């Protein structure tokens, strides 16, 4: 598990943005302040749900280890999702937000595989949850996860 000196410093910088009074904990109120600066307006119940899911020891506030543990997991999810989004843009040759059978067939060709229309149509139907005849990003991601 990688955590360099520089990575630790960056986590403390992010933590300090939340930890308004520098006591080493993040409360629901400090989280509200940050969320409002992002243009959101959560209720106290919503803030408590956000704290609760990060608050591993259940003492009501977020300490650095809890914060870093959650942030590192979120960063990995975001990295992984971005890799999936990049693949989707590559497959979606005309950039219209759907992978068509023809696009999928050309993709296969470029990867050294020759499929018939029949075979690619099958692959599309497999992923085409909403029945529009093509594969959108949500449908693609569902096949990856």
């Amino acid at each position: 598990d990688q955590l360099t000196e520089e990575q630790i410093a960056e986590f403390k910088e992010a933590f300090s943005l939340f930890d308004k009074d520098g006591d080493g904990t993040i409360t629901t109120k400090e989280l509200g302040t940050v969320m409002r600066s992002l243009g959101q307006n959560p209720t106290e119940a919503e803030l408590q749900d956000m704290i609760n899911e990060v608050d591993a020891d259940g003492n009501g506030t977020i300490d650095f280890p809890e914060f870093l543990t959650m942030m590192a997991r979120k960063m990995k999810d975001t990295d992984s999702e971005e890799e999936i989004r990049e693949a989707f843009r590559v497959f979606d040759k005309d950039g219209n937000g759907y992978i068509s059978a023809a696009e999928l067939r050309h993709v296969m060709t470029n990867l050294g595989e020759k499929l018939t229309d029949e075979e690619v149509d099958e692959m599309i139907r497999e992923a085409d949850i909403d029945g529009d005849g093509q594969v959108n990003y949500e449908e693609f991601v569902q096949m990856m996860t």
Partner: peptide
């Protein structure tokens, strides 16, 4: 006899292999 089908995940991973 029959043709084997490819998966969406295998396609994704095949691209992953070919990139720098």
């Amino acid at each position: 006899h029959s043709m084997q089908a490819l998966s969406w995940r295998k396609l994704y991973l095949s691209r992953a292999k070919l990139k720098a």
